[PDB]
Design a protein around this nucleic acid. Structure first.
Ligand SMILES: [Mg+2]
Ligand SMILES: [Mg+2]
Lengths: 579, 735
DNA sequence: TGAGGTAA
DNA sequence: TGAGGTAGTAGGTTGT
DNA sequence: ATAAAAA
């Protein structure tokens, strides 16, 4: 079907045109600018009973598509500002950022007011047209006139095909067409995971069950929760052994007081230095949220990467159960799952067990067909720390390694890449035909030259043939370069809908966008694009994009829900908590 | 665009043979037909010819001369050797009971003779394999309901729709044993059970319990049925389970006996499973239509007639369904809301309805009465929260209806949990101490902390039914009121919960205004017929609603009825109200339509005719130029029609637009109204209309009923199913 | 802190 | 009980 | 206009 893009054609000059548009848009009375490419209206909504007003506006940019014309890209935006008191300073009619505060997306002040910024395809694509028709007119080409148009770009947008996934005991899942098979794709994915189990059948390490003491928690609620979790995790991964329990005292709760005793008293005496463990956070009674947040941060970051910790909340565990009066026995005082509250508890337990398996490096499934390139590398530079993932063919081999970054950082990163590649290439992917680095953020050539040095060393040792191999670097943008929005024009009563999963748009032969969220999943609003840009190398961009999209279908955290990032960057974000 | 319907065409009627063999009167004829059909094992197609009634029987089966013991006398019944022939192209109305009954019987027999199926009633067949992966103690069974159709194109159709049943996993074996026969007996009598009985599954109604199988004489009988069974019921049956007595759910016969092991128990969709189930049976258009197509292809194939073949086709009917247009609404200070086409204005219809009501207030601007704010005392619920809630509610009401005076507070204590002594203590002591017996008020239910369930609703029910004619109240729950304010002393609404409290208050105030008979809005254009009289009788109580043109005049009237006295009361009420109200609101009425819920026995038409004759005697209304009739509205549709729209989107099926109608006969139609501009999950359900008497036009009545559907007074932001007259009757008339 | 996208 | 619809009938061949 | 109570 035909698709509608968010591109209004203008019928080098890039910076000159941007200057003209910015200068003419800054003169509008009901239009105050906030960034180089962000504007807002000088009025809040009506019927807002809070102490914070919201400000509508639009995001604007220019595009240089391959057709041979310049285009305008427009998308909505929203700001939150308190009314009674960075600041918004005043000088006559000239208002600019530097006596009112500008709020951030965090804290409870804005969290209750967020549905106003989410618009579906029809509402969003009519608001964009209204903004174009109203404000984006009477624009001047300095002395001349600029024809900012309407009736947005209509194109036949192609899409990738959903790859065939590989599960345990074979039992693959493949999509043949736009039939009832694809309609239940996410449900089939989750059901196959639940039935067959995880693909990785390697042995387990030692796990623990460190929970609060008896003075704060009962001795039967924890027993029932542990038994249910053990049953589910044994059904999923049959190699699980046991879930031995550690009890630690509360010792009041004001500010990080329990953290001092947590390591030296109970953890050191029981020799629990090595393991994975599971922690229940004490908030059963009335609690101060700041203490719980600080406790979570200190529990995750106090220990170095040994004993990686996945936590849980005691409130939900207690709410999911009921204190039965053990009718039939004496003194059991056990807790049971409420009969009307079984499905939600099952979903809770499934998600928690999946998370604990992810932190245990047991991947649930993989792709049946090999990707076009053998080696994929994901590098992220966390605060003062860095993380690397190595992704081999199909997805059966994913390796993760953290590192402390102390310049000599390039030397350390190059050494890490060299040793990891020389250790792992002969084991999993002998004679690779291509190495791709996927870097989150911005690239400066350090990773590319490190890969070049490692390739030269490996060719000196004869591991990989230099002539047939290729290497390249691609950059992932979590915030898109330009806010591209597309919709599918249909015959239904609502004439627009979200694009299908896999719709790609290449702006330049080295830059493009992928819409992973789409038809087989359900979302509120319009899908946002994931932006990729290949910087250097001798790769084919189309193959890299197809492999990245196939990596997006590997949703290890929530298989039922959709996934926005490829599994390598998502795994870094999950397993790279500070230190 | 085209719409895919739920009908499958029988493309073999051109070569089907057919044959013949031959209130109190209607009941006697029905009884005669039931008795002959029971003894001949076939369909009865009772025919009227030459002012006489005969029972139709196909010529293959014989019929022996005898007598049937009727109530006045035992009428002799006799075979008539004359046999009549019906061609494929002459199915005139006297023969309409024929063809229909023959096909029905044949299809029911062949469907009940299936392996992986069983029948629940005359027209519902379910699978014997329940839904997999249910963690509760309730099995969900999925099946279909079918019906025959006589669409005016000239062909018979099969209408098939999905259905679900909820049955516990095991009943009468692990629930009651011989040691507690008299303990829980009263918790099972009068219910509906499923009996397997080998490979002949049927539903039953239990008349009580009995002795055990080893003593009641019936062993070696069930062992015969479980021997030739595809299910190993040998382990199920043990000589310890007691013998239960059953009858058929249809009518009364002798009290048969059977064991308690094979009997499972069914649930009507009110006892339990609410909000823990009922979400598995909600299916969208594409999924439901795919399941229907699979059922038709799986079981409605290679069907056999008596000697021929039944060629039921596939690819269900594809037509072009027409629709009515959305009427234009009228609000306070004019402020019309009209829809010009399929544009953005149609998209925000419900939201703009609510916004216009919020901005402009209610349209009815008459005076008010004395109001109360029945609320717990100072020790329970305190006083500062009460004062803040009262201030906010008063501000909202005065913003909505500017004739509001005040909100006089009344305090009551709670004491203990009795639900009957607290009934007298709560509203028969403090309200009787004051002069607060006439008014409207609104009560705040005490549910602050650790309130016990299963009684508060009972209390609430009592609170809705003591002083009904003089103290019509609207309830509210203190748990939700206390969930917004938090102590700081003084009480202030929390900053995070500001929109939620606003929505709660707006809906509560709108419901309280509806109790006060202050209609928020009305239609702009007049209806085709001036007067609409909606009648609805249930639970010994009757309710009438008089709707004048435009709806600016909607008058509700409750009545108590106990059957000739009932008809006299109905006639008196209709005549008195019409004579009182016609000269005021509708001078020289053009027509009178009685929208009746349920089934019409002809009493309404007689009452309307008598009232019209008396009115013409008074000279108020004419006789040559006047129309009057009765239209029956069915809450549960006769044939289960479903409509979906064909679109090129990724989901190829969509719900039809609001107001899409399809008529099957000259006097039978279906309307779909919960469609596009509103948001629902699942498929829209039809509304069924059919005339009974009178000389009205059916198109005008259908369009006016759809126009009345668009008047939503309870929740303006959501969809509506019933027309405003029946919806108002159901909202009021709480006892 | 059960978890995803959309909002930023 | 702030509220809406979607889910949900009637229940004649006979099935000891 | 808002998220549930509802794979
Ligand atoms: Mg987490
Ligand atoms: Mg109510």
């Amino acid at each position: 079907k035909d698709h509608i893009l968010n591109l209004y054609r203008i019928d080098v000059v890039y910076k000159f045109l941007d200057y003209e548009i910015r200068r003419q848009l800054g003169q509008h009375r009901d239009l105050w600018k906030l960034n180089t490419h962000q504007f807002f209206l000088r009025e809040p909504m009506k019927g807002i009973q809070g102490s914070i007003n919201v400000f509508e506006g639009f995001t604007y940019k220019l595009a240089r598509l391959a057709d041979g014309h310049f285009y305008v890209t427009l998308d909505l935006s929203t700001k939150y500002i308190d009314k009674y008191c960075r600041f918004l300073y005043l000088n006559g009619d000239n208002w600019y950022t530097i006596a009112r505060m500008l709020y951030n997306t965090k804290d409870e002040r804005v969290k209750s007011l967020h549905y106003l910024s989410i618009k579906g395809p029809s509402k969003r694509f009519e608001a964009i047209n209204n903004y174009i028709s109203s404000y984006f007119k009477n624009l001047k080409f300095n002395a001349g006139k600029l024809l900012i148009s309407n009736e947005p770009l209509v194109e036949k947008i192609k899409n990738f095909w959903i790859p065939e996934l590989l599960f345990n005991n074979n039992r693959r899942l493949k999509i043949t067409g736009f039939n009832s098979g694809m309609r239940d794709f996410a449900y089939q994915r989750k059901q196959l995971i639940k039935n067959n189990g995880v693909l990785n059948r390697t042995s387990f390490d030692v796990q623990y069950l460190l929970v609060p003491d008896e003075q704060y928690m009962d001795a039967n609620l924890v027993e029932g929760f542990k038994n249910n979790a053990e049953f589910l995790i044994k059904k999923l991964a049959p190699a699980f052994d046991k879930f031995i329990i550690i009890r630690y005292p509360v010792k009041s709760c004001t500010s990080a007081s329990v953290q001092i005793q947590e390591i030296e008293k109970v953890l050191h005496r029981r020799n629990a230095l090595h393991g994975f463990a599971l922690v229940v956070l004490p908030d059963l009674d009335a609690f101060s949220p700041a203490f719980l947040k600080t406790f979570h941060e200190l529990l995750k970051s106090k220990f170095y990467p040994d004993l990686k910790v996945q936590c849980a909340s005691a409130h939900n565990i207690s709410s999911f159960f009921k204190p039965f009066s053990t009718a039939g026995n004496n003194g059991i005082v056990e807790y049971r799952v409420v009969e009307a509250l079984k499905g939600r508890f099952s979903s809770y337990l499934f998600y928690l067990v999946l998370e604990h398996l992810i932190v245990n490096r047991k991947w649930p499934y993989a792709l049946a067909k090999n990707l076009f390139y053998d080696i994929y590398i994901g590098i992220d530079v966390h605060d003062r720390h860095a993380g690397f993932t190595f992704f081999f063919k199909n997805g059966e081999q994913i390796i993760f390694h953290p590192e402390e970054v102390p310049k000599v950082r390039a030397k350390t990163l190059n050494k890490v890449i060299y040793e990891k590649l020389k250790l792992y290439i002969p084991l999993f992917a002998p004679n690779p035909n291509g190495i791709v680095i996927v870097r989150d953020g911005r690239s400066f050539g350090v990773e590319y030259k490190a890969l070049q040095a490692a390739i030269n060393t490996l060719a000196a040792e004869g591991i990989v043939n230099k002539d047939t191999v290729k290497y390249g670097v691609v950059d992932l943008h979590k915030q898109s370069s330009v806010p591209i929005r597309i919709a599918a024009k249909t015959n239904s009563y609502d004439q627009l809908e979200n694009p299908v999963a896999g719709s790609y748009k290449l702006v330049s032969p080295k830059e493009g966008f992928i819409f992973s969220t789409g038809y087989p999943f359900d979302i509120k609003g319009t899908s946002r694009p994931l932006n990729l840009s290949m910087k250097e190398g001798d790769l084919d961009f189309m193959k890299v994009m197809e492999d990245v999209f196939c990596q997006i279908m590997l949703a290890f955290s929530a298989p039922d829900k959709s996934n926005f990032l490829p599994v390598i960057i998502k795994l870094i974000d999950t397993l790279l908590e500070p230190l | 665009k085209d719409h895919i319907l739920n009908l499958y065409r029988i493309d073999n009627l051109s070569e089907l043979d057919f044959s013949y063999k031959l209130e109190l009167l209607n009941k006697q004829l029905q009884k005669i037909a039931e008795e002959v059909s029971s003894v001949t094992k076939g369909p009865t197609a009772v025919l009227k010819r030459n002012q006489r009634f005969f029972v139709a029987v196909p010529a293959d089966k014989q019929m022996e001369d005898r007598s049937i013991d009727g109530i006045p006398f035992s009428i002799p019944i006799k075979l008539l050797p004359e046999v009549y022939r019906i061609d494929s192209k002459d199915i005139q109305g006297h023969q309409l009971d024929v063809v229909y009954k023959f096909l029905d019987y044949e299809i029911r027999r062949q469907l009940g003779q299936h392996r992986d199926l069983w029948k629940l009633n005359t027209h519902q067949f379910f699978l014997r394999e329940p839904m997999k992966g249910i963690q509760g103690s309730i099995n969900v069974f999925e099946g279909f309901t079918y019906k025959l159709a006589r669409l005016a194109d000239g062909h018979f159709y099969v209408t098939l729709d999905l259905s679900t049943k909820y049955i516990d996993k095991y009943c009468l074996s692990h629930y009651i044993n011989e040691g507690n026969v008299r303990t829980f007996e009263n918790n099972y009598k009068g219910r509906r059970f499923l009996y397997l009985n080998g490979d002949n599954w049927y539903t039953i109604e239990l008349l009580g319990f009995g002795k055990s199988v080893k003593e009641q004489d019936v062993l070696n009988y069930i062992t015969e049925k479980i021997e030739h069974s595809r299910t190993d019921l040998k382990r199920y049956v043990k000589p310890n389970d007691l013998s239960m007595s059953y009858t058929y759910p249809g009518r009364t016969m002798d009290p048969h006996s059977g064991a308690t092991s094979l009997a499972r128990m069914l649930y009507n969709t009110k006892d339990e499973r609410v909000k823990s189930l009922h979400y598995l049976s909600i299916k969208g258009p594409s999924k439901r239509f795919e399941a229907i197509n699979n059922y038709i292809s799986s079981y409605f194939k290679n069907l056999k007639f008596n000697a021929g073949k039944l060629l039921i086709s596939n690819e269900p009917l594809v037509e072009k369904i027409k629709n009515f247009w959305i009427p234009e609404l009228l609000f306070n200070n004019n402020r019309r809301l009209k829809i010009t086409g399929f544009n953005s204005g149609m998209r925000d219809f419900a939201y703009q309805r609510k916004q216009l009501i919020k901005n402009n207030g209610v349209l009815n601007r008459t005076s008010f009465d004395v109001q109360y704010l029945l609320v717990p005392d100072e020790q329970y619920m305190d006083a500062n929260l009460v004062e803040g809630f009262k201030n906010n509610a008063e501000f909202l009401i005065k913003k909505l209806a500017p004739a509001f005076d005040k909100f006089i507070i009344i305090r009551y204590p709670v004491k203990s949990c009795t639900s009957a002594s607290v009934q007298i203590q709560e509203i028969e002591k403090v309200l009787h101490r004051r002069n607060a017996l006439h008014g409207f008020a609104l009560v705040v239910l005490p549910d602050l902390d650790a309130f016990s369930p299963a009684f508060l609703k009972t209390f609430h029910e009592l609170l809705k039914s003591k002083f009904y004619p003089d103290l019509k109240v609207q309830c509210a729950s203190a748990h939700n009121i206390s969930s917004f304010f938090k102590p700081f002393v003084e009480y202030r609404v929390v900053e995070a919960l500001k929109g939620r409290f606003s929505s709660y208050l707006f809906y509560l105030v709108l419901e309280h205004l509806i109790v006060n008979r202050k209609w928020p809005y009305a239609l702009a254009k007049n209806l085709f017929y001036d007067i609409y009289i909606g009648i609805d009788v249930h639970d010994r109580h009757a309710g009438f609603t008089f709707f004048f043109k435009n709806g600016e005049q909607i008058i509700f009237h409750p009545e108590e009825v106990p059957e000739k006295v009932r008809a006299k009361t109905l006639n008196k009420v209709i005549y008195e109200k019409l004579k009182l109200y016609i000269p005021l609101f509708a001078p020289n009425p053009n027509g009178i339509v009685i929208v009746r819920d349920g089934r019409s026995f002809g009493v309404e038409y007689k009452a309307l005719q008598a009232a019209i004759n008396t009115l013409a005697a008074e000279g108020i209304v004419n006789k040559d130029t006047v129309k009057y009739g009765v239209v029956d509205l069915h809450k549960q549709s006769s044939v289960p029609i479903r409509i979906a729209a064909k679109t090129n989107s990724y989901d190829q099926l969509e719900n039809p637009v609001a107001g899409s109608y399809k008529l099957v006969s000259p006097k039978e139609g279906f309307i779909f109204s919960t469609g596009y501009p509103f948001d629902i999950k699942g498929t829209s359900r039809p509304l069924n209309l059919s005339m009974k008497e009178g000389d009205l036009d059916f198109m005008k009545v259908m369009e006016d009923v759809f126009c009345q559907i668009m008047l939503a007074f309870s929740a303006p932001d959501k969809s509506n199913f019933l027309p405003v007259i029946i919806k108002l009757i159901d909202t009021l008339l709480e006892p």
